[PDB]
Ligand binder design. Sequence first.
Ligand SMILES: CC(C)(C)NC(=O)[C@@H]1C[C@@H]2CCCC[C@@H]2CN1C[C@@H](O)[C@H](Cc1ccccc1)NC(=O)[C@H](CC(N)=O)NC(=O)c1ccc2ccccc2n1
Lengths: 99, 99
Amino acid sequence: PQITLWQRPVVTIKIGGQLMEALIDTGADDTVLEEMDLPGRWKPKIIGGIGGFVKVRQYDQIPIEICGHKVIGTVLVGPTPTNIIGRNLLTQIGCTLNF
Amino acid sequence: PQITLWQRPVVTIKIGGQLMEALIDTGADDTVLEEMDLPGRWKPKIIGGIGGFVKVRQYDQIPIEICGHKVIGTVLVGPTPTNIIGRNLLTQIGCTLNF
Ligand SMILES: CC(C)(C)NC(=O)[C@@H]1C[C@@H]2CCCC[C@@H]2CN1C[C@@H](O)[C@H](Cc1ccccc1)NC(=O)[C@H](CC(N)=O)NC(=O)c1ccc2ccccc2n1
């Protein structure tokens, strides 16, 4: 579909059989969701945002269903206030920027 | 143009009669630039990011020529790794997400 930028581009994702709301973010190199337990093991990871660096878990190759398109990929889990779908899973769902 | 997400979406903007590289970021509400002083007066603002809250200068109603379309809006300036083009000035050029 064609989503507009008048409001934040929020889509529902299905990770772990449960649905939540995520935010389409083309500026993020990776995907970072709010802290929780996912069905796998994790490693530690450090990623930086505006203002400072954060410490997150790194669940690798998790199967996440982004709005009809099923994908697999690395999701980071940390103290973020909003779930972010970065450009690792977006390129998978065939997402582009047009203007 | 039709931009893909395999690479980071880097668009060149002209602000202050100077050219600079910027990132097309749909997750950012505001447009944040590198530390510098452009034409005009400023007021304060504290924005948030993944790694906490940072302090920036707010330059209101500034003319930026994104990708050739001359547009207007508030540009923030403070400490940031890259120049960010948020949703406020994206809508102005008619940017959309599609998949
Ligand atoms: C710019 C501003 C208006 C403040 N908005 C945001 O920062 C919003 C705020 C939203 C609500 C709070 C939680 C985060 C989301 C998404 N972020 C957008 C979001 O896209 C943000 C923009 C950004 C890019 C580069 C440098 C700094 C900031 N990116 C990020 O946070 C990603 C996270 C990641 N590793 O995937 N950081 C980077 O992609 C990234 C890349 C290289 C870097 C080099 C040095 C230091 C930091 C670096 N950060």
